[PDB]
Design an enzyme around this catalytic site. Sequence first.
Site, PDB file in Angstrom:
ATOM      1  CG  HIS A  66      -5.334   9.211  -0.067  1.00  0.00           C
ATOM      2  ND1 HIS A  66      -3.945   9.192  -0.309  1.00  0.00           N
ATOM      3  CD2 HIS A  66      -5.234   8.321   0.896  1.00  0.00           C
ATOM      4  CE1 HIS A  66      -3.255   8.808   0.697  1.00  0.00           C
ATOM      5  NE2 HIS A  66      -4.272   8.804   1.608  1.00  0.00           N
ATOM      6  NE  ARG A  80      12.672 -12.899   7.763  1.00  0.00           N
ATOM      7  CZ  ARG A  80      11.483 -13.532   7.287  1.00  0.00           C
ATOM      8  NH1 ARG A  80      10.533 -14.273   7.676  1.00  0.00           N
ATOM      9  NH2 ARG A  80      12.245 -13.767   5.878  1.00  0.00           N
ATOM     10  CE1 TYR A  95       8.037   1.914   6.380  1.00  0.00           C
ATOM     11  CE2 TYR A  95       9.626   3.128   6.053  1.00  0.00           C
ATOM     12  CZ  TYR A  95       9.091   2.624   5.030  1.00  0.00           C
ATOM     13  OH  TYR A  95       7.963   3.534   4.624  1.00  0.00           O
ATOM     14  CB  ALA A 142      -5.205  -2.602  11.367  1.00  0.00           C
ATOM     15  CG  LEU A 143      -0.406  -3.002  13.694  1.00  0.00           C
ATOM     16  CD1 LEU A 143       0.908  -3.697  13.183  1.00  0.00           C
ATOM     17  CD2 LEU A 143      -1.731  -4.978  14.305  1.00  0.00           C
ATOM     18  CG  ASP A 197      -2.511   1.477   1.074  1.00  0.00           C
ATOM     19  OD1 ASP A 197      -2.469   1.461   0.823  1.00  0.00           O
ATOM     20  OD2 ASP A 197      -1.612   2.179   1.903  1.00  0.00           O
TER      21      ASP A 197
HETATM   22  N1  LIG Z   1      -6.187   5.375   2.884  1.00  0.00           N
HETATM   23  C1  LIG Z   1      -6.454   6.680   4.024  1.00  0.00           C
HETATM   24  O1  LIG Z   1      -6.378   7.358   4.158  1.00  0.00           O
HETATM   25  C2  LIG Z   1      -4.080   5.582   5.025  1.00  0.00           C
HETATM   26  C3  LIG Z   1      -4.601   6.865   6.159  1.00  0.00           C
HETATM   27  C4  LIG Z   1      -3.161   6.460   6.593  1.00  0.00           C
HETATM   28  C5  LIG Z   1      -2.668   5.003   6.579  1.00  0.00           C
HETATM   29  N2  LIG Z   1      -3.040   4.474   5.052  1.00  0.00           N
HETATM   30  C6  LIG Z   1      -1.878   3.361   4.773  1.00  0.00           C
HETATM   31  O2  LIG Z   1      -1.812   2.088   6.139  1.00  0.00           O
HETATM   32  C7  LIG Z   1      -1.139   1.806   6.260  1.00  0.00           C
HETATM   33  C8  LIG Z   1      -0.631   1.124   8.165  1.00  0.00           C
HETATM   34  O3  LIG Z   1      -1.461   2.105   8.852  1.00  0.00           O
HETATM   35  P1  LIG Z   1      -1.079   3.130   9.906  1.00  0.00           P
HETATM   36  O4  LIG Z   1       0.335   4.370   8.799  1.00  0.00           O
HETATM   37  O5  LIG Z   1      -1.830   3.727  10.912  1.00  0.00           O
HETATM   38  O6  LIG Z   1      -0.014   1.630  10.842  1.00  0.00           O
HETATM   39  P2  LIG Z   1       0.062   0.806  11.940  1.00  0.00           P
HETATM   40  O7  LIG Z   1      -0.777  -0.714  10.958  1.00  0.00           O
HETATM   41  O8  LIG Z   1      -1.492   0.810  12.768  1.00  0.00           O
HETATM   42  O9  LIG Z   1       0.609   0.824  12.920  1.00  0.00           O
HETATM   43  C9  LIG Z   1       0.663   0.779  14.014  1.00  0.00           C
HETATM   44  C10 LIG Z   1       2.251   1.262  14.342  1.00  0.00           C
HETATM   45  O10 LIG Z   1       2.433  -0.014  14.663  1.00  0.00           O
HETATM   46  C11 LIG Z   1       3.983  -1.007  14.676  1.00  0.00           C
HETATM   47  N3  LIG Z   1       4.130  -2.134  14.615  1.00  0.00           N
HETATM   48  C12 LIG Z   1       4.396  -2.920  13.084  1.00  0.00           C
HETATM   49  N4  LIG Z   1       3.630  -3.812  13.369  1.00  0.00           N
HETATM   50  C13 LIG Z   1       4.256  -3.961  14.420  1.00  0.00           C
HETATM   51  C14 LIG Z   1       3.521  -5.677  15.703  1.00  0.00           C
HETATM   52  N5  LIG Z   1       3.756  -7.122  15.305  1.00  0.00           N
HETATM   53  N6  LIG Z   1       3.322  -5.665  17.077  1.00  0.00           N
HETATM   54  C15 LIG Z   1       3.881  -4.363  17.444  1.00  0.00           C
HETATM   55  N7  LIG Z   1       3.983  -2.981  16.880  1.00  0.00           N
HETATM   56  C16 LIG Z   1       4.286  -3.368  15.361  1.00  0.00           C
HETATM   57  C17 LIG Z   1       4.839  -0.232  14.173  1.00  0.00           C
HETATM   58  O11 LIG Z   1       6.094   1.104  14.892  1.00  0.00           O
HETATM   59  P3  LIG Z   1       6.827   0.106  14.195  1.00  0.00           P
HETATM   60  O12 LIG Z   1       7.753   0.317  12.729  1.00  0.00           O
HETATM   61  O13 LIG Z   1       8.717   0.350  14.686  1.00  0.00           O
HETATM   62  O14 LIG Z   1       7.046  -1.335  13.803  1.00  0.00           O
HETATM   63  C18 LIG Z   1       3.085   0.571  13.035  1.00  0.00           C
HETATM   64  O15 LIG Z   1       3.728   2.214  12.978  1.00  0.00           O
HETATM   65  C19 LIG Z   1       0.010   3.096   6.648  1.00  0.00           C
HETATM   66  O16 LIG Z   1       0.868   2.341   6.152  1.00  0.00           O
HETATM   67  C20 LIG Z   1      -0.809   3.598   4.941  1.00  0.00           C
HETATM   68  O17 LIG Z   1      -0.331   2.843   3.841  1.00  0.00           O
HETATM   69  C21 LIG Z   1      -4.090   4.583   4.868  1.00  0.00           C
HETATM   70  C1  LIG Z   2     -10.406  10.056   7.352  1.00  0.00           C
HETATM   71  C2  LIG Z   2     -10.031  10.789   6.102  1.00  0.00           C
HETATM   72  N1  LIG Z   2     -10.199  11.833   5.441  1.00  0.00           N
HETATM   73  O1  LIG Z   2      -8.934  11.375   4.373  1.00  0.00           O
HETATM   74  C3  LIG Z   2      -7.367  10.973   4.672  1.00  0.00           C
HETATM   75  C4  LIG Z   2      -6.694  11.288   3.855  1.00  0.00           C
HETATM   76  C5  LIG Z   2      -8.525  10.711   6.049  1.00  0.00           C
HETATM   77  C6  LIG Z   2      -7.815   9.800   7.323  1.00  0.00           C
HETATM   78  O2  LIG Z   2      -6.499  10.227   7.244  1.00  0.00           O
HETATM   79  C7  LIG Z   2      -5.879   9.542   8.289  1.00  0.00           C
HETATM   80  C8  LIG Z   2      -5.108   8.318   9.174  1.00  0.00           C
HETATM   81  C9  LIG Z   2      -4.974   8.007   9.419  1.00  0.00           C
HETATM   82  C10 LIG Z   2      -3.315   8.752   9.580  1.00  0.00           C
HETATM   83  C11 LIG Z   2      -2.994   9.601   8.975  1.00  0.00           C
HETATM   84  C12 LIG Z   2      -3.939  10.238   7.940  1.00  0.00           C
HETATM   85  C13 LIG Z   2      -3.651  11.474   7.610  1.00  0.00           C
HETATM   86  O3  LIG Z   2      -2.566  11.597   7.502  1.00  0.00           O
HETATM   87  N2  LIG Z   2      -4.550  12.454   7.242  1.00  0.00           N
HETATM   88  C14 LIG Z   2      -5.007  13.646   6.583  1.00  0.00           C
HETATM   89  C15 LIG Z   2      -6.052  14.375   5.707  1.00  0.00           C
HETATM   90  C16 LIG Z   2      -6.237  15.014   5.311  1.00  0.00           C
HETATM   91  C17 LIG Z   2      -5.109  15.853   4.670  1.00  0.00           C
HETATM   92  C18 LIG Z   2      -3.867  15.576   5.110  1.00  0.00           C
HETATM   93 CL1  LIG Z   2      -2.408  16.093   4.696  1.00  0.00          CL
HETATM   94  C19 LIG Z   2      -3.696  14.520   6.120  1.00  0.00           C
END
Ligand SMILES: NC(=O)c1ccc[n+]([C@@H]2O[C@H](COP(=O)([O-])OP(=O)(O)OC[C@H]3O[C@@H](n4cnc5c(N)ncnc54)[C@H](OP(=O)(O)O)[C@@H]3O)[C@@H](O)[C@H]2O)c1
Ligand SMILES: Cc1noc(C)c1COc1ccccc1C(=O)Nc1cccc(Cl)c1
Length: 314
Positions: free
Chosen positions: A112, A273, A267, A213-214, A45
Amino acid sequence: QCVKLNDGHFMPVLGFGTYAPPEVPRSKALEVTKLAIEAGFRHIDSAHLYNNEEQVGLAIRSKIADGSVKREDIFYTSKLWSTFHRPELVRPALENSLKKAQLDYVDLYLIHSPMSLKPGEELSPTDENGKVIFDIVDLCTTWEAMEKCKDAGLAKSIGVSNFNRRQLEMILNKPGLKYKPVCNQVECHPYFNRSKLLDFCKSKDIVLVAYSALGSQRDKRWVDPNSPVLLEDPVLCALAKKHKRTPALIALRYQLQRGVVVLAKSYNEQRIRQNVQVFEFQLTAEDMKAIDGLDRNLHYFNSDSFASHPNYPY
Ligand SMILES: NC(=O)c1ccc[n+]([C@@H]2O[C@H](COP(=O)([O-])OP(=O)(O)OC[C@H]3O[C@@H](n4cnc5c(N)ncnc54)[C@H](OP(=O)(O)O)[C@@H]3O)[C@@H](O)[C@H]2O)c1
Ligand SMILES: Cc1noc(C)c1COc1ccccc1C(=O)Nc1cccc(Cl)c1
């Protein structure tokens, strides 16, 4: 280990999250994406917002090149950012994301956010008074430009992200519709589990993809330090002792057993793993309804600055 999408192609149910704050050196996104692929991830992703598509695309291109994997084994995902919602800006944004990542197509292109921002090179345009400049765009026009990209062959599947029920129906109740969104990527975790939204998506052959999810990265710009840390929940910590697993594995298995495709950012090589092992154990019906009761409708992303936008999803 995939789920069929409503346009025919398949999506791995476990995905790798690539976002890291701009404080993290860009070289890391290359190292950890290769480690994720070596660990067993085939769903990656990314997005134009994350400023990492070259390192991510390089890591994918490099694992294909050393013979570990082929392009068909990789499900790569990018996202159209909110400054590119005018229909004419959609295809150039995807081509730019493909040029940057050095791929001929993305497996998945997402809208997005529904909150359209003013077009420009700034990921967040700001006016004189430092406030974010919104923009009004009929999103069905954006989706038509998205549909053409699939016709053009640059995106195998197209979908949306952070769409509520009403915004989702606007796309489904669209005249001349050609491709429904294969997925809606939203925040989802035991503290905010999207049960009513997931039922709606199930009822439309739309896959719910869980981000955070984490329990999210808790970045200071967007999260309250007093908010509960999901991986410190006593219920999640208890089940991890019963199954001899980790609280993260409990959260990941929770989504996999209710028909949710789950993402996981890491990261850290060992935790990277560690996350693929979600397929090695099973949650019981009692464990599932125990986690079910943790829903407290908790948005880890909170922004009053984006609370005044007409299309704000919550
Ligand atoms: N569509 C959207 O609007 C949107 C918004 C936000 C994020 N995302 C995407 O979703 C992906 C994941 O969401 P997120 O950024 O909120 O992170 P996340 O998946 O919720 O993980 C949260 C933290 O938990 C740690 N972690 C990972 N594996 C672990 C494990 N087995 N045990 C304990 N801790 C663990 C990680 O730190 P460490 O790195 O130190 O392991 C991570 O930073 C993002 O990378 C992004 O691509 C999409
Ligand atoms: C709800 C929703 N609607 O759009 C998005 C994207 C979301 C969730 O956003 C996050 C979720 C999780 C972590 C970060 C973000 C984020 O950084 N949002 C963002 C929104 C606006 C501008 C900019 Cl720069 C960042």
